[PDB]
Hints:
mainly alpha; Arc Repressor Mutant, subunit A; globular; binds ammonium ion
Amino acid sequence: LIKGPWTKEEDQRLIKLVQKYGPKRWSVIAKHLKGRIGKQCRERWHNHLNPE
Ligand SMILES: [N+]
């Protein structure tokens, strides 16, 4: 499956997954998010949820 815009529910789940796995295991994190691949999770984290 392929998803486009992120929902608030997905963002919340991503926050919890990064807390569990850390910001380097993107492939494992993506396995828990339907329709998402590792790079999408990485970009959502660095650009929107945890900006510099
Ligand atoms: N996925």
